[PDB]
Design a protein around this ligand. Structure first.
Ligand SMILES: *[C@@H]1O[C@H](CO)[C@@H](O[C@@H]2O[C@H](CO)[C@@H](O[C@@H]3O[C@H](CO[C@H]4O[C@H](CO)[C@@H](O)[C@H](O)[C@@H]4O)[C@@H](O)[C@H](O[C@H]4O[C@H](CO)[C@@H](O)[C@H](O)[C@@H]4O)[C@@H]3O)[C@H](O)[C@H]2NC(C)=O)[C@H](O)[C@H]1NC(C)=O
Ligand SMILES: *[C@@H]1O[C@H](CO)[C@@H](O[C@@H]2O[C@H](CO)[C@@H](O[C@@H]3O[C@H](CO)[C@@H](O)[C@H](O)[C@@H]3O)[C@H](O)[C@H]2NC(C)=O)[C@H](O)[C@H]1NC(C)=O
Ligand code: NAG
Ligand code: NAG
Ligand code: NAG
Ligand code: NAG
Ligand code: NAG
Ligand code: NAG
Lengths: 50, 50, 50, 200, 50, 21, 150
């Protein structure tokens, strides 16, 4: 919590809402439209806790 | 400090950044502030150099 | 893990630019291949010891 | 899409009259040009179309006219919705004015050039190099929302899909991405902003 | 992402303007520099990532 | 008195102002 | 109206209801035309102008032409118009480097750079900065006054 500036690792938004395009493009949409796609972390922190 | 920029426009020369922080030269030094609320019965010749 | 369509990155889907990209051959292909190969390597290993 | 403005067009012509060749096609006779009948001109109308006209004749036969371009544009391009905040053409040297030259090659190829044209201009949506006097009262802009389309959004060419975004950005007109991509542009005529999505 | 805005020695940071403004041959000429800039930055990024 | 409250603001004599909010 | 030279800008309308075409008449002997300044936007908030001809409107350089000297006002705000004035504040302004935090194209906060700590901050990108070692330039002559050596 103190380290994750995003609050959660889940903030990697699904690119589908990026493809919505009704609202204004965000940073995720900026890079996606540039052709960039961040993949989800190979495991979540919950699995690490497990 | 405390000013909320009720209508203040950042001087974007072509296109405005929606969100972020930018270091730039903007006329933020204040000279002879005049704040007359809803009155101008004045024929005035604002001149530079003065 | 991160990916990007360098073809889109440079051309942004512009076919007229796409032909030009093609003449630089596997530059884009090699880039993506290295990315994916690496990433899948980490994927499989981290899934391994986890 | 550009700034809302009065429908104003002025046909730019620039007539060039020359005679080349002489005897055995290797000589010259004369060459001159004017911008719509004058040595210099500046567009005031929002719209303007160049209509290059040629009284150029080889005394021995035909003249091949080739275009030089020391300019960010071509004669075939300027009409294509090119946008300026100013644009001025001079037949003579003009400071900070890009150069466009024409070369008249007679049948035997004298190979000479025409007059250098100097274009001092600044980008903006005040005056538009137009292919035709645009229509539309108080505004010549047009768009197809939710349509994969070509566009020139205040000079921002490109391809994309335009979707009304209900945002209410008081400041600015058209906002670009961190990566210098126009993400949303305001109609400003209605003060409404549209998000742009690449088709692919 | 921010790399690509740099008009890498070209007339503009975007391509269709180059296509429209000048004849395709010259537009190809200019875009080559952008192409190289983009891929090169990709390369440096790639090596960093690796 | 709240006068010190308004004193907290850097201010100069012809500053005819209105504090708000 | 959109034509001073074909029609009078004698306005037949009041309180807008039409974005009022702003035309800017040249008043020299050999140029007396009204340049179309701008279709009146729906609502202006702040206008800023600069010595070097920067007519700046709502975050946009509509004109930013050659240097202006006399920005003279005749806004007929006399009589009952003394309670109709739009002039509510005006401030002369000097350019200064500063870091601006903005969100939703709306100004949030500012930081000047004159102070060495602030100089480092604006030299950096964040209003706040971390405890560490940072590059800095030896203070030059504050007055430029560079002599010429040839
Ligand atoms: C949109 O884009 C346009 C593009 O031109 C911008 O226009 C320029 O904006 C800059 C930003 O301030 C202006 O810079 C200022 O220039 C003034 C005039 O220039 C003289 O002085 C400088 C510095 O002395 C010389 O280098 C130059 O050769 C000229 O002799 C100066 O008065 C300003 O300098 C101030 O600070 C220096 C110290 O740094 C002091 O020594 C000076 O005395 C002075 O106090 C500053 O350099 C620039 O002039 C603008 N262009 C033109 C042609 O004037 C718009 O600003 C930009 N934004 C909009 C429109 O909002
Ligand atoms: C941005 O939003 C404004 C606000 O509507 C749009 O302006 C609108 O433009 C259309 C055509 O340009 C106007 O239609 C008018 O219809 C009447 C009746 O058919 C006709 O007589 C007129 O000649 C005109 O065609 C409409 O009134 C006008 N709305 C206004 C001024 O409020 C504008 O199209 C939008 N987009 C852009 C790029 O400006
Ligand atoms: C209006 O302009 C005239 C000159 O055009 C000037 O003398 C006068 O001071 C200005 N203001 C008023 C209120 O008349
Ligand atoms: C500028 O100001 C200086 C000093 O105030 C004065 O000597 C000079 O005449 C002024 N020039 C102009 C053009 O205002
Ligand atoms: C320029 O060409 C247009 C048509 O393209 C014509 O209407 C106009 O009269 C011409 N003007 C001059 C000065 O040649
Ligand atoms: C022919 O040339 C003359 C002068 O050289 C010019 O006045 C005239 O307009 C030209 N004719 C055409 C059709 O361009
Ligand atoms: C904007 O908000 C209104 C009200 O909730 C809604 O009806 C509209 O669909 C929204 N549009 C966009 C593009 O978000
Ligand atoms: C306007 O400028 C031109 C250009 O030299 C000049 O010939 C003309 O006399 C000027 N108009 C006047 C002085 O009324």
């Amino acid at each position: 919590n103190k380290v994750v500036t995003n609050g959660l690792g889940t903030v990697d938004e699904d690119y589908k809402r990026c493809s919505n395009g009704r609202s204004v493009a965000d940073l995720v949409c900026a890079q996606y439209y540039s052709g960039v796609m961040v993949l989800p972390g190979v495991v979540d922190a919950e699995k690490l806790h497990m | 400090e405390g000013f909320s920029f009720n209508n203040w426009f950042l001087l974007s020369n072509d296109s405005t950044l929606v969100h972020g922080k930018v270091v730039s030269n903007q006329p933020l030094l204040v000279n002879c502030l005049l704040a007359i609320p809803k009155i101008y019965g004045l024929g005035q010749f604002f001149s530079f150099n003065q | 893990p991160v990916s990007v369509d360098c073809a889109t990155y440079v051309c942004n889907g512009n076919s007229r630019c796409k032909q030009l990209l093609t003449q630089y051959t596997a530059a884009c292909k090699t880039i993506e291949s290295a990315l994916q190969l690496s990433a899948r390597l980490e994927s499989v290993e981290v899934n391994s010891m986890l | 899409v550009t700034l809302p403005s009065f429908n104003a067009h002025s046909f730019v012509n620039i007539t060039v009259s020359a005679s080349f060749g002489g005897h055995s096609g290797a000589n010259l006779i004369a060459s001159d040009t004017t911008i719509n009948g004058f040595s210099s001109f500046c567009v005031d109308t929002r719209q303007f179309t160049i209509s290059l006209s040629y009284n150029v004749t080889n005394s021995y036969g035909y003249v091949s006219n080739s275009q030089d371009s020391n300019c960010p544009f071509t004669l075939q391009s300027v009409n294509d919705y090119l946008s300026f905040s100013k644009f001025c053409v001079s037949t003579s040297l003009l400071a900070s004015a890009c150069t466009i030259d024409l070369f008249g090659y007679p049948e035997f190829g004298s190979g000479v050039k025409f007059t250098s044209l100097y274009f001092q201009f600044t980008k903006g949506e005040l005056i538009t190099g137009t292919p035709k006097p645009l229509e539309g009262v108080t505004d010549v802009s047009f768009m197809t929302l939710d349509v994969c389309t070509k566009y020139t959004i205040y000079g921002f060419k490109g391809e994309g899909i335009i979707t009304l975004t209900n945002s209410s950005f008081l400041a600015g007109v058209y906002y670009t991405s961190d990566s210098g991509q126009l993400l949303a542009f305001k109609n400003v005529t209605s003060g409404a902003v549209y998000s742009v999505t690449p088709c692919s | 992402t921010v790399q690509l805005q740099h008009n890498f020695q070209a007339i503009s940071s975007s391509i269709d303007d180059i296509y429209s403004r000048l004849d395709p041959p010259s537009a190809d000429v200019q875009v080559d520099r952008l192409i190289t800039g983009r891929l090169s930055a990709l390369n440096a990024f790639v090596a960093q990532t690796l | 008195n709240f006068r010190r409250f308004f004193s907290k603001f850097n201010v100069q004599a012809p500053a005819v102002v209105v504090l708000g909010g | 109206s959109s034509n001073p030279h074909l029609a009078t800008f004698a306005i037949p309308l009041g309180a807008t209801q039409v974005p009022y075409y702003c035309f800017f008449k040249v008043d020299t002997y050999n140029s007396t035309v009204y340049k179309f300044l701008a279709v009146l936007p729906p609502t202006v908030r702040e206008i800023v102008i600069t010595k070097y001809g920067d007519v700046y409107v709502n975050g946009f350089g509509y004109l930013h032409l050659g240097l202006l000297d006399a920005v003279t006002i005749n806004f007929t705000g006399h009589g009952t118009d003394d309670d109709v004035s739009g002039f509510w504040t005006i401030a002369s302004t000097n350019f200064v480097d500063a870091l601006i935090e903005v969100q939703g194209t709306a100004i949030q906060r500012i930081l000047y750079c004159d102070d060495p700590v602030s100089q480092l901050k604006c030299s950096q990108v964040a209003f706040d900065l971390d405890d560490g070692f940072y590059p800095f330039s030896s203070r030059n002559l504050l007055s430029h006054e560079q002599p010429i050596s040839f």
